[PDB]
Write a protein that binds this DNA or RNA. Structure first.
Lengths: 66, 149, 129
RNA sequence: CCCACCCAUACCCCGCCCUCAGGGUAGAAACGAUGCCCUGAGGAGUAGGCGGCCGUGGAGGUCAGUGACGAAGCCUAGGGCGUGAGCCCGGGUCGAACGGCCUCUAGUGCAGAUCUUGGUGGUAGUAGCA
RNA sequence: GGGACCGAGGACCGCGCUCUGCAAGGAUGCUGGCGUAAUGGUCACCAGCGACCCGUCUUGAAACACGGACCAAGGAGUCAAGGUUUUGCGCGAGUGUUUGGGUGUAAAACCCGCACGCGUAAGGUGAGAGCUUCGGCGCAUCAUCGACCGAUCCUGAUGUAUUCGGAUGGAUUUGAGUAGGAGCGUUAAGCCUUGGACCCGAAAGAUGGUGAACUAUAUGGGGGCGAAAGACUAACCAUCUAGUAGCUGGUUACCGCCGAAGUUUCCCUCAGGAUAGCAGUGUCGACCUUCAGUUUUAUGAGGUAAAGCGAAUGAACUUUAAAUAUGUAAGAAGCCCUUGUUACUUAACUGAACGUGGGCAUUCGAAUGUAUCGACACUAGUGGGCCAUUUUUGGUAAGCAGAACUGGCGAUGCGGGAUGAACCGAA
RNA sequence: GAGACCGAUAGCGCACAAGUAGAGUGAUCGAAAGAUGAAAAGCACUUUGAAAAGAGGGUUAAAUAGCACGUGAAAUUGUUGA
């Protein structure tokens, strides 16, 4: 009952914060793609296909390799 | 009106439209009047303005009552301990800002003026320096007092 | 208060008398007495012979103890001293004990007659708490 | 850009009402003192709070009250008082009781409740009377 | 010089002046017509301007919905018991006759025995209303230090029945404590609970009666278990019942004064409570004592803009420093300095706390306002939001969404914007 | 025997030929409705009209009390006046 009362009182702020957090996550996703393309335009060093690991660990690995 | 200008109006005793009050120039009150810039019209009165404001619309606060200044006697009981014993002394102390200007102005009830004879200006709610009526009209408040008496 | 709450006609006479006294005299004693007659009964708690005795134990002898209240007898006080007591009303036992000790009973109108400005008066009120 | 002019319950002067606040009023030629006089200020208002008044049935006291030479009730393109709820008078009808004042008492105040009862409208001299 | 509106009061007093008097604390003098429907007032109509149909309900507001054919009479917070607050009255450490008895002019009134109900069987410092012989006395009550008692944890005295007790000193303890009684009875008003409980209205259940309805044949009537034999478990009438709702509708003269909230926190998941706030009543202490949505001064958080680099160095540079809002403090409710104590502490009379002395009572330590402020107790209605400015976070093609402040609406009439919840002026 | 009770929409459902009229197969349900005048003295007689009734006349203090009867409001209606 205590927990559900807290949820009822703070319900809408949770929705607003979730929406802002998802927009934020979209923002760093696009930003990471931006430095990806900047690095590939500047230079680089790939194979025939491209890394089969997920597109996240892949981008961190390549921007750590430089 | 925001609360800050509301308090300033309450502390300057201007509580009705067309209620005028004498003030001495000093940085604190200059800042107060600058805060109430969008609600008042202020200037420097001359001897004629002070004299006629005291003689025609001069009411004193005698024991918390608005008593017309009809007698040098009542002027003397209310302001005798300051040396002000007549209407001429009151006018001198107000115009030539003397040591006891605070007491003299506090004794003087805020002068309840009428609407000016001849109108304000076509657009009276902007600053006097852009052709309005609000703000600091330096020596033109004498003309405004002529119109408002 | 402009009108007394009580319907006692003699209390109205008293409040009129002390209104005149407070208006035409400089007496804070008279003003306080008028206010105490105006205030209601719960705000006028009783004063006992023990209270007045312990208040006159000091050099306040040969004086008029004045209470705007009812003076009540205290069984715990074995000896009642001489004292000039003025009050609204006395109990039968307090009246008898004061008169047997040698004091005199005074009403407020009498108190006004002998001492209009309350000279040599010690003014008491009862325990409010 | 300049001049004059129009008007809000707004602002200024005056009158009046109410409220609040501040003063005065006894060796009484003295006062609905719950009264009177002076001065100043204020005045929108839902829920709510407080106070004073108006009205109805009955009770005690009083007006040595009113009344068949006309009580009460009712009607009035007749008047007077009160801000108001209301109160008083004139004219017509009517016939047998009624009222003011201080207290007491309560089955005491209506436009609503698809309110209850009763009476009466438009629909309408209409649908209709096979 | 011309015009307009007004004439409040009713012997004298007063301020004065130009003083045989006067425009000096509020209008007098002269004259005319009429002396009655002439003034004035009420009804009917016309004219100019103004003007949505009332109540209920919901919502931030409308709109919708609901009730309204008309009139007369009736028509809805009452009574009892038990609590509680305040006001009046009586008696008062007591109070209450009315169970009953005794009179009686007979349900009245008057009187009273024994019980019974409820209550009852010590200070100092600083203040403080009030007296004062002006030397001081000092009610109630408050802050602190006190003294004692019921209770708790100890400390452990003569002794004692050899196992019985609490005296002294104590404790960051507790009382709805003592600390020189306030209660009882009753009147009036208010609130709470229970009764029909402001009035009207839900489906149900039960007790006792009256009747009929079935191509089912005087009779048989439901269900499941079991091989059976068998064990188990409708309708109308009156009454209980004025049954039970938080839901709907309604809830009856006038005027005057004072007048809101739509919110914080906590508890609990409900047809919500508590605390605070707004409003009001009573009591206590002061006198603009003192306070204040405000400026100024001093000091923080923004070095944000700007000037220079013929100052150094290089928004991240600086001598300086914008605009813009914003927190704290501004005196006797004070600072220090000085030395007496302490169980604290220090190598130490050494520091800290508790006190003494001093210093300024007059500008006592900025301005301006001040239609008083603070404390305690009790009481009623409130717990919704909508729009907009500015600042700010995010996003879309554009929309738009979320916070903070302030402002309009509620409960607010009036002038203007032709019209009109959100506009302008002004209450 | 009384009442700070109610006073014909009140007070018992019933102040009256009221548990009556009436409704229901039945158990049962269950009303409305008082007032001339002191005294009927309750309108002789004439005329019109088939009658009902009307117009004269009459009783009475009053018929502006006619057994559609004390007083006689509102809604609603007719005539006349504006």
């Amino acid at each position: 009952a205590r927990k559900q009362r807290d949820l009822k009182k703070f319900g809408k702020a949770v929705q607003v914060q979730k929406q802002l957090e998802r927009a934020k996550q979209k923002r760093e996703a696009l930003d990471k793609i931006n430095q990806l393309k900047r690095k590939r335009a500047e230079g680089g060093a790939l194979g025939a296909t491209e890394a089969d690991d997920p597109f996240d660990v892949a981008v961190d690995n390549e921007l750590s390799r430089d | 009106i925001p609360p800050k200008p509301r308090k300033i109006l309450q502390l300057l005793r201007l509580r009705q439209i067309n209620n005028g009050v004498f003030v001495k120039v000093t940085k604190a009150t200059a800042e107060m009047i600058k805060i109430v810039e969008p609600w008042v019209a202020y200037g420097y009165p001359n001897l004629k303005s002070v004299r006629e404001l005291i003689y025609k619309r001069g009411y004193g606060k005698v024991n918390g009552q608005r008593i017309p200044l009809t007698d040098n006697a009542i002027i003397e009981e209310n302001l005798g301990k300051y040396g002000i014993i007549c209407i001429e002394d009151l006018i001198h102390e107000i115009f030539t800002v003397g040591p006891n200007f605070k007491q003299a102005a506090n004794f003087l009830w805020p002068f309840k003026l009428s609407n000016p004879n001849g109108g304000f200006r076509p657009r009276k709610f902007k600053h006097f320096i852009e052709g309005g009526d609000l703000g600091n009209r330096e020596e033109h408040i004498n003309a405004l007092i002529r119109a408002m008496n | 208060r402009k009108a007394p709450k009580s319907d006692n006609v003699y209390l109205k006479l008293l409040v009129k008398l002390y209104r005149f006294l407070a208006r035409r005299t400089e007496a804070p004693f008279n003003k306080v007495v008028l206010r105490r007659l105006f205030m209601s009964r719960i705000n006028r708690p009783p004063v006992s012979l023990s209270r007045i005795a312990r208040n006159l134990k000091n050099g306040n002898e040969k004086k008029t103890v004045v209470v705007v209240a009812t003076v009540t007898d205290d069984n715990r006080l074995l000896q009642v001293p001489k004292m000039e007591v003025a009050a609204l009303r006395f109990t039968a036992k307090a009246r008898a004990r004061i008169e047997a000790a040698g004091g005199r009973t005074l009403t407020l109108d009498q108190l006004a007659l002998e001492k209009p400005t309350g000279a040599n008066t010690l003014l008491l009120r009862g325990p409010k708490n």
